Amino acid sequence: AMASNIFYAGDATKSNYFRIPSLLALDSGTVIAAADARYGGTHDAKSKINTAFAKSTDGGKTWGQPTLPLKFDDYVAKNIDWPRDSVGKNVQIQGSASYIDPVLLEDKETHRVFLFADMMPAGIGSSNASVGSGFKEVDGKKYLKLHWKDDAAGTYDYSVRENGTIYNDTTNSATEYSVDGEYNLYKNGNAMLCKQYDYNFEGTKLLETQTDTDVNMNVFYKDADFKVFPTTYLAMKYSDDEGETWSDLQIVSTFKPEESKFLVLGPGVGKQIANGEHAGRLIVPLYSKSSAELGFMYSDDHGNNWTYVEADQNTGGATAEAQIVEMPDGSLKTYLRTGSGYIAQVMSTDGGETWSERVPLTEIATTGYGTQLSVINYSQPVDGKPAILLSAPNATNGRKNGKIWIGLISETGNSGKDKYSVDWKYCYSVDTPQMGYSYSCLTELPDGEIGLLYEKYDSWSRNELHLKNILKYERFNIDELKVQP
Numbered sequence: 001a002m003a004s005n006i007f008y009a010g011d012a013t014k015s016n017y018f019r020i021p022s023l024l025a026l027d028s029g030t031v032i033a034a035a036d037a038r039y040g041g042t043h044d045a046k047s048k049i050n051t052a053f054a055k056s057t058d059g060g061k062t063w064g065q066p067t068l069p070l071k072f073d074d075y076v077a078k079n080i081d082w083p084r085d086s087v088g089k090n091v092q093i094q095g096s097a098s099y100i101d102p103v104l105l106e107d108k109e110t111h112r113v114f115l116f117a118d119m120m121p122a123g124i125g126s127s128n129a130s131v132g133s134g135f136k137e138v139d140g141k142k143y144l145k146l147h148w149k150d151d152a153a154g155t156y157d158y159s160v161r162e163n164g165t166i167y168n169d170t171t172n173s174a175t176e177y178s179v180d181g182e183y184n185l186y187k188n189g190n191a192m193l194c195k196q197y198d199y200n201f202e203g204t205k206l207l208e209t210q211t212d213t214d215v216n217m218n219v220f221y222k223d224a225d226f227k228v229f230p231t232t233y234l235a236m237k238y239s240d241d242e243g244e245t246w247s248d249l250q251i252v253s254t255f256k257p258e259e260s261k262f263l264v265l266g267p268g269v270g271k272q273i274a275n276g277e278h279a280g281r282l283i284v285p286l287y288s289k290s291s292a293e294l295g296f297m298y299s300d301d302h303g304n305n306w307t308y309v310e311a312d313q314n315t316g317g318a319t320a321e322a323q324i325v326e327m328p329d330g331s332l333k334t335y336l337r338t339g340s341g342y343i344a345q346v347m348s349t350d351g352g353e354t355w356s357e358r359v360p361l362t363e364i365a366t367t368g369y370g371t372q373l374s375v376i377n378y379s380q381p382v383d384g385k386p387a388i389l390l391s392a393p394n395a396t397n398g399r400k401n402g403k404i405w406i407g408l409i410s411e412t413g414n415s416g417k418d419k420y421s422v423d424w425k426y427c428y429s430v431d432t433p434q435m436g437y438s439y440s441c442l443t444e445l446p447d448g449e450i451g452l453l454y455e456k457y458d459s460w461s462r463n464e465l466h467l468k469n470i471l472k473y474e475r476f477n478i479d480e481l482k483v484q485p
């Protein structure tokens with residue numbers, strides 16, 4: 001029993017733990033949020049994680065019951081206390097599928113909300129993903145590949161075609177199997193079933209055990225008769241009613257480079273270009289262990305099709321989580337985490353198709369492993385200039401000393417990528433410098449206030465794992481944030 005929160009232990013998600021905030025004010029004034037619902041403590045995948053979603057209809061002041069738009073059912077969703085001793089803390093659920101690391105984006109022209117998450121097959125996370133796309137080509141077309149249970153481990157002789165029908169690719173003929181819009185498996189039109197797993201500890205032993213509860217068998221599960229290639233996928237659903245209902249699951253990572261180990265989202269929000277030649281383009285940040293590290297996916301047709309862009313030729317596989325802001329002419333500036341001990345910035349003057357080399361951002365102190373950041377546009381001038389805001393920790397030694405910065409944009413007299421300069425004029429301290437501060441997401445609320453949803457602890461530290469109710473929500477008026485310390 002415990003003593004502000006959107007997601008919390010005992011809410012409708014049935015998770016005791018959350019990480020990875022996303023916060024987005026919609027054009028209508030509705031405000032939405034999403035996070036990982038991390039059931040098996042605060043571990044990254046491999047684990048049991050669902051994506052939670054919540055909505056405010058009073059301008060982001062109060063919040064409704066969360067829902068779970070992206071969820072798997074192979075393992076039960078329940079409230080469990082994860083152990084925090086020196087042995088048990090390291091224990092992770094081994095055999096569950098998961099959705100991890102959300103991105104929210106609105107297309108303001110169509111009023112469609114998109115929710116993206118990484119989609120991890122059972123027992124997979126980024127660190128143990130196999131190299132490959134997960135797709136094969138049958139006569140020039142890309143289809144999701146499948147492994148049948150009685151074939152050799154390395155053999156994916158089956159494909160999900162545009163039908164939903166599973167085909168044998170050696171004979172090119174349709175099987176009796178198919179998937180529905182959630183990638184659940186059917187034979188002869190009958191739902192195929194498997195037993196759901198529970199998870200319970202005995203001392204520091206984690207027991208993952210079948211129950212008697214039947215669930216839909218899914219190609220992402222450990223127990224399935226057909227199974228996907230064990231790499232990372234990008235999932236998306238869209239909503240035309242501000243998150244009351246969602247579309248079928250879309251696997252959008254058809255473009256995943258064959259040489260990549262993982263290709264995942266930079267969590268937070270995406271961006272729709274407001275100004276210039278590429279107004280209307282939807283763009284979402286990504287990163288990879290591949291030919292490239294930073295990347296993006298964009299759509300010019302309101303979300304139906306997505307093009308992958310590599311932003312560099314970095315083979316590091318660092319956690320290059322990025323967020324994007326727009327300059328007054330429509331050019332883009334992306335701020336990113338790196339594995340080099342600074343936040344980097346890259347620019348694009350062609351709507352995100354090409355990007356400048358990284359420039360360190362000197363104003364902010366970070367660790368060698370880095371932390372996600374949040375950057376947003378602000379709709380009103382500050383000190384007569386277009387303004388952006390940035391939220392991140394400010395410390396070389398841990399994730400702590402959270403700040404909200406305000407950056408004012410000027411023309412430099414130069415051209416191209418050098419057209420604009422940002423003066424980080426204002427720096428507001430969220431709390432005492434010692435207080436933990438990890439991932440965060442900013443949004444501009446419909447009254448011009450700034451909302452912040454953030455991890456109020458150090459989510460890297462091996463000594464702060466599995467803390468409950470650390471995702472805190474605060475609201476500020478802009479005058480409060482205008483502090484020059």
Ligand SMILES: CC(=O)N[C@H]1[C@H]2O[C@@](C(=O)O)(C[C@@H]1O)O[C@@H]2[C@H](O)CO
Pocket residue numbers: 020044045100101118125126127264319370371459460
């Ligand atoms: C897909 C995935 O695993 N994303 C993770 C990664 O970023 C975080 C992090 O806190 O830094 C949390 C994210 O949910 O931890 C991971 C890091 O790569 C090494 O721990």
